[PDB]
């Protein structure tokens, strides 16, 4: 049903730019952390794990930045053209990229904010290279919103399937069935209902509102990554 | 120009079944390992990292097993109309699942076969807790072939893009530029023109990959037996 416009190309590019900003925030802070960790002998292998993760993010970021959206969108000629692309078909691989990224961030966040945090204290007997509580909060808040934005894109256009399901979203749902939290207005972001959209004009409007929110979260994230990079400088990097 | 048949539904289900077999081999052996690790106090947090990974695989496996392919394939007012689905459109999300999974396995394999292996020896000096060299070979051989199969599906139907690129494939290519070939990742994917041709080649891939997964299973059984005899 819903059809492409000439403005569709730039809408995709704008969505992908968020993903790139999310990826790049992580790559920056992780590059710093990896450098610091070079000077800690006991964290040698954890460091290599982080490098493996950061390489994956970096690759997703080059992939996204090199993607020319117009090369994959067949526009229509004066309006109707029975060969022009469905909006469905065009958003699908973008959404699909988001899902792959989001599930990567899930794996990374657990390692970075939980396992490794505990290991750092166990091995080093100090807090000098742990993350701040606020950075963890920001990480999780940003993840949650990108998960929800990803779900919005997919469910709004009814382009979902078992294969595009996010682990965290299904977990929330299965947890509410078993517990009984899916009754009524829920306070849990993942359980709230996605309204379908019927025009591309409507998707664009809602998309740009999401864009504003997510940029807000990424600036908070950046700010907290700046604080912890400073912390790492003051507590570890700088010698006396 | 490249159209669905009634047989397409089963071709997808068969491809997905391989992915499920790949996921399930890992889940089985990791469940065992996670259990053995419960008795090693110094590996407590590494264990939780493995759990996080195995949960992700398990979810991809439930997702794949619960996917009813026919619910997403418009066969059409049989073999007629432009309303019926392109084969392109139908393979695309299957290929896309493979890519997500393959990149997850990449992250996992590095942790499992490299970092964690070194960490295990550093913390314990106990080679009973390590993987066998042969299991590592198998892991890497299976990964390589699933990467190549994934690339075949994508490039054969010309449905690729920057977003479906696999990290390991681009790395091989960028390494050859900076440096006929013996390297699996650099060798050229021939386009396919019919679904009959895709099906034929698909089933040949299916045979090869099942061969790799049995070798994998066999090596996972050897390492699990070692873990059983030496601890459990």
């Amino acid at each position: 049903d819903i059809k492409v416009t000439p403005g569709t190309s730039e809408l995709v590019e704008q969505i992908l730019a968020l993903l790139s900003r999310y990826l790049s925030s992580y790559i920056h802070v992780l590059n710093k952390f990896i450098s610091h960790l070079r000077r800690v002998a006991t964290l040698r292998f954890e460091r290599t794990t982080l490098i493996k993760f950061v390489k994956k993010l970096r690759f997703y970021n080059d992939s996204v930045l090199s993607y020319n959206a117009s090369e994959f969108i067949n526009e229509g000629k004066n309006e109707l053209d029975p060969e022009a692309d469905s909006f469905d078909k065009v958003i699908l691989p973008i959404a699909s990229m988001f899902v792959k990224s989001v599930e990567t961030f899930d794996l990374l966040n657990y390692y970075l904010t939980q396992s490794l945090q505990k290991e750092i204290l166990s091995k080093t007997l100090n807090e000098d290279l742990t993350l701040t509580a606020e950075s963890i909060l920001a990480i999780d808040d940003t993840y949650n919103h990108f998960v929800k934005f990803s779900q919005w894109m997919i469910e709004s256009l009814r382009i979902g399937s078992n294969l595009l399901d996010l682990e965290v979203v299904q977990f929330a749902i299965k947890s509410a069935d078993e517990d009984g939290t899916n009754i009524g207005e829920t306070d849990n972001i993942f359980l709230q209902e996605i309204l379908p959209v019927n025009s591309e004009e409507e998707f664009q409007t809602l998309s740009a509102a999401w864009h504003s929110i997510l940029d807000g979260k990424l600036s908070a994230l950046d700010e907290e990554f700046d604080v912890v990079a400073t912390k790492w400088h003051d507590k570890f990097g700088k010698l006396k | 120009d490249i159209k669905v048949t009634p047989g397409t539904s089963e071709l997808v289900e068969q491809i997905l079944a391989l992915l499920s077999r790949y996921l399930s081999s890992y889940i089985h052996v990791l469940n065992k390992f996670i259990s053995h690790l419960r008795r090693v106090a110094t590996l407590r947090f590494e264990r939780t990292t493995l759990i996080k990974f195995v949960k992700k695989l398990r979810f991809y496996n439930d997702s794949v097993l619960s996917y009813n392919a026919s619910e997403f394939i418009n066969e059409g007012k049989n073999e007629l109309d432009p309303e019926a689905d392109s084969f392109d459109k139908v393979i695309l999300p299957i290929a896309s699942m493979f890519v997500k999974s393959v990149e997850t396995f990449d992250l996992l394999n590095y942790y499992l076969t490299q970092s964690l292996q070194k960490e295990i020896l550093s913390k314990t000096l106990n080679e009973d807790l390590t993987l066998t060299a042969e299991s590592i070979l198998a892991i890497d051989d299976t990964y390589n072939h699933f990467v190549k199969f994934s690339q075949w599906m994508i490039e054969s139907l010309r449905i690729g893009s920057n977003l479906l690129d696999l990290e390991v494939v681009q790395f091989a290519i960028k390494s050859a530029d900076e440096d006929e070939t013996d390297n699996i990742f650099l060798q050229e994917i021939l386009p396919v023109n019919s679904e009959e041709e895709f099906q034929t080649l698909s089933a040949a891939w299916h045979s090869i990959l099942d061969g790799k997964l049995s070798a994998l299973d066999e090596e996972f059984d050897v390492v699990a037996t070692k873990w059983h005899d030496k601890f459990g």
Binding site: D106, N109, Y110, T113, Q114, I136, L137, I139, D140, D141, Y143, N144, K148, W152, S156, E167, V168, F171, A176, T181, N182, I183, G184, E185, T186, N188, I189, L191, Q192, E193, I194, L195, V197, L206, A209, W210, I213 | I51, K52, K55
Partner: peptide, 20 residues
């Protein structure tokens, strides 16, 4: 005690109801 988030305890969202 969670695999899904390190912040257990976490305003209206575009295209979303408040309703499960």
């Amino acid at each position: 005690r969670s695999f899904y988030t390190a912040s257990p305890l976490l305003p209206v969202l575009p295209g979303v109801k408040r309703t499960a």
